[PDB]
Amino acid sequence: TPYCVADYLLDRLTDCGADHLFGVPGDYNLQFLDHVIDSPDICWVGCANELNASYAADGYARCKGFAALLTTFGVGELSAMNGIAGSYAEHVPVLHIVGAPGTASQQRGELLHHTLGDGEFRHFYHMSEPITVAQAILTEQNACYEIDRVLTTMLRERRPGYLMLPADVAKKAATPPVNALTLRHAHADSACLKAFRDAAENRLAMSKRTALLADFLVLRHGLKHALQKWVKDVPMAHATMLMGKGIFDERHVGFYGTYSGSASAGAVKEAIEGADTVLCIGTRFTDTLTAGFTHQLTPSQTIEVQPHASRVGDVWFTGIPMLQAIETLVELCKQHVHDTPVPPDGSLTQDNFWKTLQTFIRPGDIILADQGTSAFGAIDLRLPADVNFIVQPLWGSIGYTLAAAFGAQTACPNRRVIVLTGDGAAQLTIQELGSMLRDKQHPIILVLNNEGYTVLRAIHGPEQRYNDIALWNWTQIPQALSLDPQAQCWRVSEAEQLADVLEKVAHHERLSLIEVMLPKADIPPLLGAITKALEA
Amino acid sequence: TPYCVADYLLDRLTDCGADHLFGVPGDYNLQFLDHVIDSPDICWVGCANELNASYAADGYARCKGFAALLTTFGVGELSAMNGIAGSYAEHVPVLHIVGAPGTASQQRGELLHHTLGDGEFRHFYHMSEPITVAQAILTEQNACYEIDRVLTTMLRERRPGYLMLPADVAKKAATPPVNALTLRHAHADSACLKAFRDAAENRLAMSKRTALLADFLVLRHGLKHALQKWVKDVPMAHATMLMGKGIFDERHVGFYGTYSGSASAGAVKEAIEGADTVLCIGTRFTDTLTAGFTHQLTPSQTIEVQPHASRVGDVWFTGIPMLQAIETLVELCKQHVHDTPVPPDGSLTQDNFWKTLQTFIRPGDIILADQGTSAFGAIDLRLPADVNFIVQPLWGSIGYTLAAAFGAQTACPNRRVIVLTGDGAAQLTIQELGSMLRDKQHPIILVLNNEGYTVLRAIHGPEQRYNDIALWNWTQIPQALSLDPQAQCWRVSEAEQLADVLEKVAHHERLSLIEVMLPKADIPPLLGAITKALEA
């Protein structure tokens, strides 16, 4: 077992922050998996299918800052395509390792299984190009620096990368590196940074009331602490949108609720849109986040900070790291921001469900909500400190959270994980619940059983049968997907019953599945505003 | 409800032979679905996820000759990518309809859900190019002739196509066509056909013993009856490989078993490889079908017929439709081939399981077997007449069989469907069993419970943990995935119990799930040869 390319990749992978590798084995990657098994630093996590594995890697990376997925050539990697695309869309650094047939077999154009039967072995590599920031076909002549290049780009951009690893290349001799892979964040040219500072210094100097709006890019680039410390040292009205929920302790002074354009609470609209200067840090104004692009923020009103560039008014300042821009604005806020913000039921409904959940969440919780009434209602939760709130409203692939929850719980075995998934969404990835049980995880899984696609019903055709789903027996799924599930399941239709059940499962001694019975047409306030925006 | 592009596409869909549309709804395709519901010729079949829907469409198309899949932009289509790729690899005409945001939204580059957040709306269209024979983005200016062009190419090549249908385009006015879309077989240039005929006649005229080897391209191009009548009117030794199993009644004189290269039975090797002239009709010598490319057939020994070209010896004759080449060979064979063939246990093992299943299969069965010991053991079944045998050994995506069975049963509600899936494979697509139960299907599902991936164990690392799977409670899955399942499940560990249970379920009164307990290391004969070939 001499040190080889397979070991080098695992060594670099652990340097980047991944301690687990998710995926599904295949004959093209079994020999690589031996090194995964033998490594003391990386733990193999076999998944029930590749799509769920890619979702789990995404959720893992939202907890540890990095993740890796292993699939087999062809059938495996294409199954994971939707997961990698979601990671690219929402800036999640997931490494996709594809175990591939040996280079000799590829060069001969053999009619191998998991190919299109044409002797071409690069179709799927090229198909992955639009959803990765970097990719490589590893060869005996390039392996170690292509591994380092792809991973470094992933770290810089916080987006997926792709490595094709032929079985023969994986065994090629390598040398253990003396230096661990690190990025060492870059610095702007001092004249460019000064130009941004001077324009920002001027703009803040004439600001009467300043507000701060931060979102998911600060989460991806490890700037959560900086934004939290920013608002302590300089108290001002601040919010996030749905994607960036969890950046701020929502109990803190100056927070009035999540910003969702015209669907925001009145206090939030006045806090953010009513300020004459709004600092937008890592924001992307998507249709869902803005309730149909109904946000009212003008270029003159805003200073915007993006990963490699920042904007003051109509002028863009490129080549400025987002951390350096933030550090620059903090200084300036200290110098120019003065203000002090001066701040149960019977039958289950959306309204009393989220109110009941509000009393249940605690600091340290990991909360995942799927597209549907789950995410659109969870936006109204007031998150306490140290909450990781995982939602995917830009890509918006239902089924993500259940599988992502398995990844997040794997990343954080000592934290309480709350899974809010609709009944429709959970069907898409249900087999990963078996993975949860096999690994003895204890998440609190709340299935919003409104018997179908309620969000689709509210958009169009409420009585149309294509908005119906097969009706599952949710509380019996754990006993079907495990020979001995240590799980406790309830079906609840009353709020007091839900509150009592939430008390029982508070300390997550066992996996809990709560089937929440909700009306077919019952709607959270944000989605009602969203549906109203879609008319004309 | 004026006739529009949505109605035109559905009308063309029925012309091609599809009575159902599989998929998963999304906001970008809800208005199109209204026309599917309202259509008297197309039945909407909602699936549990897009990957399964694409597998079901594939299995449907293998029964009706054509199928259609509907997904939503981005999250839907990328989930189905592995299914469409398998359809391309194995030449299955599945039409992928992608409901997309309106053209106005696309041209402004809006930050819409199900995008990468860059305003680009053609990423996924291009990513689908390598796995389709034709694709189009439908516009107001091209819709109806682009629909007809894509479908015609799909019919010509028997391979998937792709249509992007913006919601606004779907509502554009159209006119019902007077004439149904038809292919109208092409004809070879008569001099080109004559040249092939002269070369084939010379070769066959000095053939002492002639044999016929046919495979899956005969199935896809609707030539199963022609091949059957061929060997009836002209008795000779004949076989198929694994992909094309089901072309011939295997009880008939001249059939000695499936051909698998050096893994073939001794009589099969002598019947096919022992002939001085072998007619290879629609054959692709993949690694699995030939047990590691160990087939012994020389160019001078063979005459080969492919969809658009045929070969005699070392000379290729291009531009000849495969139907015309076969008709030429049939005439020549009637003249020049001077031939006449003239011909329970205790504990469950692979050996007695397949012998027990042999006594159970009947004419008219649809049999599906997944990659693993299932497909590799089913190759030894002696199929009676009128059996549709569905296997995917070129693409080889596990999980395909369970979902494709749902599609095949949908296509043929009056036929008995037998599903042979491993425990590993069924985990990948288990939620489609819920679709089976919702639609009151009565397949016979045999789950080969060997507690892990034994095919991978045979290949490499028998005791390695990556070859293990989560252990499910298979007989309890139907009652978890349906509120009132019409099903009966059994668990069997002895050959007599299996035969007894197969006795009970004979007439598919209800959905049957038989959990077959088999040893971890037990291997069917074909897979033993394959692993031996791997040692190279």
Ligand SMILES: Cc1ncc(C[n+]2csc(CCOP(=O)(O)OP(=O)(O)O)c2C)c(N)n1
């Ligand atoms: C992979 C994928 N397929 C399809 C969709 C389209 N879609 C978005 S929301 C939704 C329905 C949500 O259903 P459910 O999870 O039951 O939520 P709720 O009823 O609370 O709205 C669908 C089908 C999607 N987002 N992702």
Ligand SMILES: Cc1ncc(C[n+]2csc(CCOP(=O)(O)OP(=O)(O)O)c2C)c(N)n1
């Ligand atoms: C989508 C996909 N992922 C992974 C593989 C790799 N693969 C091929 S066969 C196999 C194991 C088959 O397991 P099972 O279905 O239990 O069959 P067995 O050999 O145990 O009967 C695997 C993982 C594949 N073919 N397709």
Ligand SMILES: O=C(O)C(=O)Cc1c[nH]c2ccccc12
């Ligand atoms: O992991 C993979 O590559 C597989 O799908 C396993 C497999 C399915 N069919 C085969 C034929 C020969 C070798 C491996 C496989």
Ligand SMILES: O=C(O)C(=O)Cc1c[nH]c2ccccc12
């Ligand atoms: O079916 C679809 O298109 C969906 O993905 C549902 C959905 C999730 N988030 C949304 C935001 C606006 C409109 C639809 C959706």
Ligand SMILES: [Mg+2]
């Ligand atoms: Mg629902």
Ligand SMILES: [Mg+2]
């Ligand atoms: Mg198995």
